[PDB]
Amino acid sequence: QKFNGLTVLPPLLTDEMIAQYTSALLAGTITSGWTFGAGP
Amino acid sequence: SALGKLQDVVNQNAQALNTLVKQLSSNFGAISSVLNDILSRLDPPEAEVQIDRLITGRLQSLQTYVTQQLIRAAEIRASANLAATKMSECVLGQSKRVD
Amino acid sequence: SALGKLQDVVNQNAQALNTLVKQLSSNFGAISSVLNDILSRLDPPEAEVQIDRLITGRLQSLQTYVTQQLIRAAEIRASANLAATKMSECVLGQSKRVD
Amino acid sequence: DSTECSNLLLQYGSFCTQLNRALTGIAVEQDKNTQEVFAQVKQIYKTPP
Amino acid sequence: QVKLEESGGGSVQAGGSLRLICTAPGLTHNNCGLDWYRRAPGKEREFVSSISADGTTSYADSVKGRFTISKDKVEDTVYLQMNSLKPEDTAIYSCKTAFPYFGNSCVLDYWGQGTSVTVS
Amino acid sequence: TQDLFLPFFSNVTWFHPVLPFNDGVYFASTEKSNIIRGWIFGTTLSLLIVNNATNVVIKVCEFQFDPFLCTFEYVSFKNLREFVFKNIDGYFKIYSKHTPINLVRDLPQGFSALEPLVDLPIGINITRFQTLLAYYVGYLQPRTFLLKYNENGTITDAVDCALDPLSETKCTLKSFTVEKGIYQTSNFRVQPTESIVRFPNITNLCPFGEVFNATRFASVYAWNRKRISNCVADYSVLYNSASFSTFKCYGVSPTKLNDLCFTNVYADSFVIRGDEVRQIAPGQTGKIADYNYKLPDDFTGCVIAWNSNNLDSKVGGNYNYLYRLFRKSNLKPFERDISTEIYQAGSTPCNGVEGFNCYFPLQSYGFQPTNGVGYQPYRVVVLSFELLHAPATVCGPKKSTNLVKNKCVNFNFNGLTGTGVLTESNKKFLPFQQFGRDIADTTDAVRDPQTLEILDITPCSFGGVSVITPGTNTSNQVAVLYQDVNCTEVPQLTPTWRVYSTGSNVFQTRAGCLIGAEHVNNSYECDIPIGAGICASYQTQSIIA
Amino acid sequence: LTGTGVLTESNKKFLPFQQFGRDIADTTDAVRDPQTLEILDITPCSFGGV
Ligand SMILES: *[C@@H]1O[C@H](CO)[C@@H](O[C@@H]2O[C@H](CO)[C@@H](O[C@@H]3O[C@H](CO)[C@@H](O)[C@H](O)[C@@H]3O)[C@H](O)[C@H]2NC(C)=O)[C@H](O)[C@H]1NC(C)=O
Ligand SMILES: *[C@@H]1O[C@H](CO)[C@@H](O[C@@H]2O[C@H](CO)[C@@H](O)[C@H](O)[C@H]2NC(C)=O)[C@H](O)[C@H]1NC(C)=O
Ligand SMILES: *[C@@H]1O[C@H](CO)[C@@H](O)[C@H](O)[C@H]1NC(C)=O
Ligand SMILES: *[C@@H]1O[C@H](CO)[C@@H](O)[C@H](O)[C@H]1NC(C)=O
Ligand SMILES: *[C@@H]1O[C@H](CO)[C@@H](O)[C@H](O)[C@H]1NC(C)=O
Ligand SMILES: *[C@@H]1O[C@H](CO)[C@@H](O)[C@H](O)[C@H]1NC(C)=O
Ligand SMILES: *[C@@H]1O[C@H](CO)[C@@H](O)[C@H](O)[C@H]1NC(C)=O
Ligand SMILES: *[C@@H]1O[C@H](CO)[C@@H](O)[C@H](O)[C@H]1NC(C)=O
Ligand SMILES: *[C@@H]1O[C@H](CO)[C@@H](O)[C@H](O)[C@H]1NC(C)=O
């Protein structure tokens, strides 16, 4: 963590956001089959 | 050795950055590898010569680093497109493509 | 902003060309950036070094441009392959692959 | 942080701008990658209790 | 305590030839220029010749053509070849050179003694 | 373009009187009765420009001057006249423009360019001027501008490139309109406040007098070398003296020796014929250069030689001084050899018998006090020193100062020049260790020469600067993001930039310090991506994050 | 101002104090003749591949 012109930008989506997306996909698959990927 | 691929990506990025930093302590033919000493040891008309040698050397390394990163990014992008396709077709549906 | 994808390519190519042309106006650490001036205001044995510096700088800039183009062509080819696949499978048939 | 070095560097045209632009393009692409892979769902579903 | 010298003078007949050698020991390190001046009786000193570190020679109007100023590669020795001499060349010539003080090595200017060039 | 302009939105002094001429002048004047005539420029108040009834006289002379109403003489509310005067490279340039106004007691807001009017090749230093007769005076500074040329080649608009963040954005994107987004314009670096020097408190001067003003120099084949250490090395003594025939330093500038700090320093002394003096230089050849004293090809030191006619000659010529002249091999650099074996020339061993096929390897000097200078004795001293970045036991004359902590300063510990922030260490040096170092071989800790304590070094803060903007089509308001800094350390046209340095709208994110945005508690869809899960947008009107 | 090329007549209109034109790449493409005070275009000398 020492610098000469070096920086490390932080990613836009934190890890909790990635986990939320994953849980959404998983819950949709469990409760509604393949229908949620093509409509309501 | 399960999560091999992620680990290799991390390693390849941390290295080749350590190399970039370590390349900062070479002479490239000058009398020293520190700018503050060439300035503090010579008159401008030849401090310029030494500084120019250092500038050429250091500018050479940065281009190599940038080109390497530019090539690796394409590999990662191809892998990410594959992952997106697998998410669309294996998760949100049932696939008929073998394997 | 519907067609941003088709305009990014044009903008990138034009910008690269403009940078390549502008790099002709840099002396790269020589007397001047015009060959004629070095030819006139100096004798051959000393003008040769000044010419050599310009040659090195210009050659390096050209190489950088060519490498950039080589890298861009690869992703354009990837898009072309994807478009050919979509033509074969979406237009000349009915597809089951999701999304 | 030298200034003689900087003035000498100015005689090389626009290399540094090219390098910065390249690295910035690489950096911005890495968010599009994640966006494409994970953000495929309109809403946020929840399992029943 | 003399850092310079003049040598190579002598007595030669009109139309004759001779060789001058102003010899300083540290001229290679100093990289200063060299001047030959002359003094003939009944008047004041005048410029004879000059040589720079890069060999751009300059000559007096009267001596050009046969007086050639030159510098050896090593040993810090110079020459002024004289030919085509004439009796009015009988004069006392002198050198002038620069020496170090506070770092840089050309600040202190210094005239040697001079040598007699007696043409008959 | 990058040149001398009048910065936008600035004070013009308002006369209604000798004035300075720093770098250029923007003179303007509105009138109706032509009450103003001309100008007088120069230093000790020199050229003159007047306009009586019809003809305009522009003359340069030396004059006699409370005015009211020869190297060159180019003789020949309703109205507003604007003039720009500047003096570059021996030329004096005048630009001008006329316009009609109907307004009182104030400058109109408008844009109009100034065509060039004349160039005069005088070549006189100018530092002051005075008018001759409501008139306005400004000044010119180096700036960068973005100029807009229309179809016919007339400048119709311009952007000052350092007024405020939005103008800088418009500069980087060579355009006059900006789309909604986030753009990265400049870098930001903290600056050193002071300087610190710390040297040990010894006072004994180095014994140069002993070496130089000596008694009996050794002969060249056995040259005396003396180490010098633990002393202040003031060179002013060698500077003042002017009786030197050669003073040349190879790896360093001879006029900077009072500032450096050397690790190991050696002084070599001997006496040589003047003719062989040239042989003391790296890479040269000869009998001295190959058999008696060889200098390396990467030498780093100084050579000081002068003449010793009045000290080293006998009545018939001193014969003590000696030198090797017959050796079976060349000398590697800094190699001494004082063996006394007869040199074999033939194919029969000498067996300690000189004469046939056998010569003594030495030969002496005759210093007749009346020879040519090419033969008179010369005393030569060679100072050779190693010049690493190190404890540097030998240091020149310099004054120590106090110690400053927790501020970006500019330090020098026994030649460890650098810049950064010094704090107190929790490290455990060992009684022989002088400084620390990190993985990448970077100095990151030192030991105080005068109190023997351990200081950590960290670099001064720096980062990038980005500008958050809704499109200029929507508003002229912006926010600024300083990347990866702490909001305390943020400190520039005061009416424009200083607004984005303080206020009640400072927010601290995981991506940097955000200035000019208001932090709400709601949550929306992302509009402009800041980072680390933070976005920003334009709503109800101001900018929210 | 020296160069090589083909000089033709034009219809661009300078301003009464301007001497030559320039392009987006900052390369000369027009010039005003010192005496007749006309505007000439400069076009590069033809080249290509075979
Ligand atoms: C070797 O010894 C000689 C002895 O003459 C040293 O030269 C002389 O050193 C003295 C001591 O400072 C100088 O005196 C100073 O003179 C200046 C005016 O030039 C005056 O302003 C000072 O107040 C002081 O009196 C003297 O000038 C100098 N030169 C001569 C010709 O006497 C020499 O420095 C010694 N060398 C070494 C390496 O010690
Ligand atoms: C430069 O001199 C030439 C030579 O006279 C001028 O060309 C003539 O200008 C007159 C002006 O009335 C015309 O009537 C002629 O037809 C021109 N051509 C000739 C005489 O061959 C030219 O105008 C001058 N230009 C400047 C800028 O001084
Ligand atoms: C001009 O300076 C005065 C103070 O002397 C003050 O009115 C202000 O700082 C300036 N005026 C502006 C910026 O309009
Ligand atoms: C023209 O200039 C001369 C020079 O001093 C001056 O005396 C004269 O008054 C001027 N003419 C007019 C009409 O102002
Ligand atoms: C002008 O100033 C320069 C340096 O400031 C000086 O060398 C020169 O002699 C000056 N000339 C006049 C005429 O004042
Ligand atoms: C340029 O001048 C012509 C006059 O011939 C005028 O018609 C035109 O409007 C001008 N260009 C612009 C952009 O106004
Ligand atoms: C002089 O330096 C020594 C080095 O340790 C230190 O102990 C001493 O305190 C210094 N002198 C003064 C007056 O502080
Ligand atoms: C910023 O500085 C303050 C005070 O020094 C400190 O409390 C805070 O933790 C710092 N923030 C970061 C991100 O370092
Ligand atoms: C946001 O909510 C938190 C917790 O309720 C509170 O501490 C904070 O003051 C709120 N911010 C605003 C701007 O109301």
Author numbering:
A (entry chain B): 853 to 892
B (entry chain B), C (entry chain A): 943 to 1041
D (entry chain B): 745 to 793
E (entry chain E): 1 to 82, 82A, 82B, 82C, 83 to 100, 100A, 100B, 100C, ...
F (entry chain A): 51 to 66, 82 to 110, 116 to 135, 138 to 141, 166 to 172, 186 to 242, 264 to 621, 628 to 676, ...
G (entry chain C): 546 to 595
Paper passage:
Here, we isolate anti-RBD nanobodies from llamas and from mice that we engineered to produce VHHs cloned from alpacas, dromedaries and Bactrian camels. To define the region bound by nanomouse nanobodies, we collected single-particle cryo-electron microscopy data on a Titian Krios for Nb12 and Nb30 in complex with HexaPro, a prefusion construct of the SARS-CoV-2 spike. By contrast, both nanomouse Nb12 and Nb30 recognize RBD at a surface outside the ACE2-binding site. Second, nanobodies isolated from nanomice (Nb12 and Nb30) associate with an RBD region that is highly conserved among sarbecoviruses, but remains inaccessible to most human antibodies.
This analysis identified 4 nanobodies from llama (designed nanobody (Nb) 15, Nb17, Nb19 and Nb56) and 2 nanobodies from nanomouse (Nb12 and Nb30) with dissociation constants below 30 nM. The nanobody monomers displayed nanomolar and sub-nanomolar half-maximal inhibitory concentration (IC50) values that ranged from 11.7 nM (168.5 ng ml−1) for Nb12 to 0.335 nM (4.6 ng ml−1) for Nb19. The structure of the Nb12–spike complex revealed Nb12 to induce a two-RBD-up, one-RBD-down spike conformation, with Nb12 recognizing a region towards the middle of the RBD, outside of the ACE2-binding region and distal from the residues (417, 484 and 501) affected in emerging variants of concern. To understand how the two nanomouse nanobodies neutralized despite recognizing surfaces outside the ACE2-binding domain, we superimposed the structure of the ACE2–RBD complex with those of Nb12 and Nb30. We observed a substantial portion of Nb12 domain clashing with ACE2, which indicates that Nb12 and ACE2 binding are sterically incompatible. Consistent with these findings, we found that Nb12 and Nb30 bind to the RBD of SARS-CoV and of the bat coronavirus WIV16 and neutralize HIV-1-based pseudoviruses that carry their spike, whereas Nb56 does not. In contrast to llama nanobodies, the neutralization potencies of nanomouse Nb12 and Nb30 were largely unaltered by RBD mutations, which suggests that they recognize a region that is different from the receptor-binding motif. We found that all four llama nanobodies, but not Nb30, could bind the Nb12–RBD immunocomplex. We conclude that nanomouse VHHs circumvent RBD antigenic drift by recognizing a sarbecoviral conserved region outside the ACE2-binding motif.
